[PDB]
Amino acid sequence: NNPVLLLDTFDFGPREDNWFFYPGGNIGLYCPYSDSAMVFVSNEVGEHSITTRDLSVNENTIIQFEINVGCSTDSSSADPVRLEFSRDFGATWHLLLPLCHHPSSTYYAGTTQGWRREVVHFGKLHLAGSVRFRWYQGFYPAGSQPVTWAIDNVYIGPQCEEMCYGHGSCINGTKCICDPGYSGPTCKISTKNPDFLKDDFEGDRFLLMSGGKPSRKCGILSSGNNLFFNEDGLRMLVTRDLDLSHARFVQFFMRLGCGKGVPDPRSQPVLLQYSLNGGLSWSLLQEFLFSNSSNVGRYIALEMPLKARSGSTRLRWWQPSENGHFYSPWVIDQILIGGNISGNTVLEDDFSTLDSRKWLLHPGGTKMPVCGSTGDALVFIEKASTRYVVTTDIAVNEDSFLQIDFAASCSVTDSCYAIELEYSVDLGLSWHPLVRDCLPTNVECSRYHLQRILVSDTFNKWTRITLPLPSYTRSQATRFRWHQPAPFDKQQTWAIDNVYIGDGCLDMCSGHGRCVQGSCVCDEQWGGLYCDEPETSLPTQLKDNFNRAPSNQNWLTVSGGKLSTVCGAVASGLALHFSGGCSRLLVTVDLNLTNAEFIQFYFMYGCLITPSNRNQGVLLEYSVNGGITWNLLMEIFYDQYSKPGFVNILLPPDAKEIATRFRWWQPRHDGLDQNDWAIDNVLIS
Amino acid sequence: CEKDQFQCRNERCIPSVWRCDEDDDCLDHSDEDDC
Ligand SMILES: *[C@@H]1O[C@H](CO)[C@@H](O[C@@H]2O[C@H](CO)[C@@H](O)[C@H](O)[C@H]2NC(C)=O)[C@H](O)[C@H]1NC(C)=O
Ligand SMILES: *[C@@H]1O[C@H](CO)[C@@H](O)[C@H](O)[C@H]1NC(C)=O
Ligand SMILES: *[C@@H]1O[C@H](CO)[C@@H](O)[C@H](O)[C@H]1NC(C)=O
Ligand SMILES: *[C@@H]1O[C@H](CO)[C@@H](O)[C@H](O)[C@H]1NC(C)=O
Ligand SMILES: [Ca+2]
Ligand SMILES: [Ca+2]
Ligand SMILES: [Ca+2]
Numbered sequence A: 001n002n003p004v005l006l007l008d009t010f011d012f013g014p015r016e017d018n019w020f021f022y023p024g025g026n027i028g029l030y031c032p033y034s035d036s037a038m039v040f041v042s043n044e045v046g047e048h049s050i051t052t053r054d055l056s057v058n059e060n061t062i063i064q065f066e067i068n069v070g071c072s073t074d075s076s077s078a079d080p081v082r083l084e085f086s087r088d089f090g091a092t093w094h095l096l097l098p099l100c101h102h103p104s105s106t107y108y109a110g111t112t113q114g115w116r117r118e119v120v121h122f123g124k125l126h127l128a129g130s131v132r133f134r135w136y137q138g139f140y141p142a143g144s145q146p147v148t149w150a151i152d153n154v155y156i157g158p159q160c161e162e163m164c165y166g167h168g169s170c171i172n173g174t175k176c177i178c179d180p181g182y183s184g185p186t187c188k189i190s191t192k193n194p195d196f197l198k199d200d201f202e203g204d205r206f207l208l209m210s211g212g213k214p215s216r217k218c219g220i221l222s223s224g225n226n227l228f229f230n231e232d233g234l235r236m237l238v239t240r241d242l243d244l245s246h247a248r249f250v251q252f253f254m255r256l257g258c259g260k261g262v263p264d265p266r267s268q269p270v271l272l273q274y275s276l277n278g279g280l281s282w283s284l285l286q287e288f289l290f291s292n293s294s295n296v297g298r299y300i301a302l303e304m305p306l307k308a309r310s311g312s313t314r315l316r317w318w319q320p321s322e323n324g325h326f327y328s329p330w331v332i333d334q335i336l337i338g339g340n341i342s343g344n345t346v347l348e349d350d351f352s353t354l355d356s357r358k359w360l361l362h363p364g365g366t367k368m369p370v371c372g373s374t375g376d377a378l379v380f381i382e383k384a385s386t387r388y389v390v391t392t393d394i395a396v397n398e399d400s401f402l403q404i405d406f407a408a409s410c411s412v413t414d415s416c417y418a419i420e421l422e423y424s425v426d427l428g429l430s431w432h433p434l435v436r437d438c439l440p441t442n443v444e445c446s447r448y449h450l451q452r453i454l455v456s457d458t459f460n461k462w463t464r465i466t467l468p469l470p471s472y473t474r475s476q477a478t479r480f481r482w483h484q485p486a487p488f489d490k491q492q493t494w495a496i497d498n499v500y501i502g503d504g505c506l507d508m509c510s511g512h513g514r515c516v517q518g519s520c521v522c523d524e525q526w527g528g529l530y531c532d533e534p535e536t537s538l539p540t541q542l543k544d545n546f547n548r549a550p551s552n553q554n555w556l557t558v559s560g561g562k563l564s565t566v567c568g569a570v571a572s573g574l575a576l577h578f579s580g581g582c583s584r585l586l587v588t589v590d591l592n593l594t595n596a597e598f599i600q601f602y603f604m605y606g607c608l609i610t611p612s613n614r615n616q617g618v619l620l621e622y623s624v625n626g627g628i629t630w631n632l633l634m635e636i637f638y639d640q641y642s643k644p645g646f647v648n649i650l651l652p653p654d655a656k657e658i659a660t661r662f663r664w665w666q667p668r669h670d671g672l673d674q675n676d677w678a679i680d681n682v683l684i685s
Numbered sequence B: 001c002e003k004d005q006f007q008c009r010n011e012r013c014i015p016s017v018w019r020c021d022e023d024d025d026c027l028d029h030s031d032e033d034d035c
């Protein structure tokens, strides 16, 4: 009961009985890109349109055709092609597909350079009866130059089954011609789509980009270009079909309004929607309202709704409007789609490549070697308004740890600066510090450390850092961020390499190796499966008089300190004086303390400026796992030691391991040559 | 001077990646002269 109603391939002239009128039409080739079509050329005087005969349409009737308007990237609201119908023999005309959520049956210039297939299901929207159709642009006096347009391959008749899932053309309502990659007699089966999308616009991710150029106007991110929807006509951006079955997120930057004050009420919202059927039907993901607080560029991260999860979902940003005219524009930047629901436990990298699925964002960062690294590192060296790197989401549990090689400027500058290190459990909508600034003020802690661990003097050159991940980082989707807080000079460079965040190497290679694919690669002088057997004898003793230069056979790190006489005799001769403006930190080589009894040294405060308060007291801590964890031995109280005193401490049994190291560090001071301290005649024996 | 470095007419050495970046890193803008 469902006859084919109209079919025209125009492929050597049209079929006369299909059409009542085609003023302005010719047969030929327009825009040989996406053979014979019905072209409506600019120059042609009078009405530009084409009208079908009267047709008995029913519940099952669709209109399907190919079209190209303008063959350009020039979005305009002028001389669009309207698909319309008439129940009164052309007396009056109406949009076949009104505007609502979905755009009207109006086809604007610039939407896509190439040809596109379109389909409207008449019978779902409108009642059966005797009906007339047309594709109308307008009526043009001689001289007018409206955009050129064309239709091809027009079918009016019964819909195919399931509408071919949106991924095919319908022949006569019985057979589907599936788009490349789609198969099955209904176009249902989908070839493996990508499960990831990233667009910075600094450059196939999109099917259409209508109504928007890449611009620097109205910017959020001062690295570069954004997508600016300032034009007229249709404002819409549409992704390729994506596998989102296991995706976690859609995130992007977005600004609503680009004006002096508050965007006006009549501004239509921006709609984020999804489609599992090639564009045929759209479900709302998020409405974005223009409001008194919208005229500001901001970060939007959303979780993937359950209903969007399929091996073939596409997304769109669309701003509705009656006549392709708008009150306030909008901007969009840094679009990422992806993640994993399995939210895996291991993110690992040596940066031979820079995979964006692991490193969502890296503004200011370059894949390059620096500072004698192994191959490339991720490097923040170039001129930047911003420097940071955000990881993708991984699942963090009891056995999870962060391990990275870090380097600051590598003797380029002598600036004192710190790289913030943060974590997020809400997809980067808010960041918290990984290591929270804690000191012997309360049992509120038993480990002691500073918020700012990654400091420029300590980390001048490559230094490994291993952190067991705190309980508050445990979630299914924790991402990490390295952040250089502005303002900052260019020459405050930094870099990361050999990143392992995960749970694959239990015990953390004992502090003497790095985890690489669930296996430990040990530091030199160490072997074994977990790096706990040393290759040679570690020294059983540490003695230092500081009458000569601190040696690399005694100390791994000396920050903020130099040999001086400024304190007078602390023990005798020169002492190691700490009065620097950045870190003040002293760290011993690993020592075999199997048979060791004590640690001792002479000690004085304020050779220059007397310490001001408690938190400025030097702490003495020990580690039996390569500095991964530190155990307080002594708070060297601030108000004590105004003249040189002697400190003698018995080693606790747990400190007497085959590889123990010590550190003295000041958590706080008023800066250069303030709250200073000195140590002489260190003895561990 | 180092390989991943560029020698200024200062005798000064800078990272070669600072050559041609609209900042004067040599202090005699010889890192910017030929771009
Ligand atoms: C957004 O700003 C508008 C403009 O100021 C606010 O609307 C005004 O509210 C004041 C006081 O309530 C009235 O006197 C004005 O007549 C309103 N102006 C107009 C023309 O809208 C509005 O309250 C703000 N929105 C929110 C949510 O605070
Ligand atoms: C579709 O149906 C019409 C009936 O008018 C016919 O002319 C045409 O050959 C059919 N097409 C195919 C490919 O079967
Ligand atoms: C999701 O997990 C698989 C590993 O099973 C991985 O290959 C893929 O890249 C992940 N996708 C994203 C976007 O993280
Ligand atoms: C630790 O010291 C003891 C004796 O002092 C020695 O037997 C052992 O081999 C030492 N370990 C290493 C590897 O230095
Ligand atoms: Ca044709
Ligand atoms: Ca951008
Ligand atoms: Ca590397």
Ligand SMILES: [Ca+2]
Pocket (backbone or CB within 6 Å): A545, A546, A547, A571, A572, A573, A574, A575, A680, A681
């Ligand atoms: Ca001395």
Ligand SMILES: [Ca+2]
Pocket (backbone or CB within 6 Å): B018, B019, B020, B021, B022, B023, B024, B025, B026, B031, B032
């Ligand atoms: Ca330069």
Ligand SMILES: [Zn+2]
Pocket (backbone or CB within 6 Å): A420, A422, A483, A485
């Ligand atoms: Zn920060």
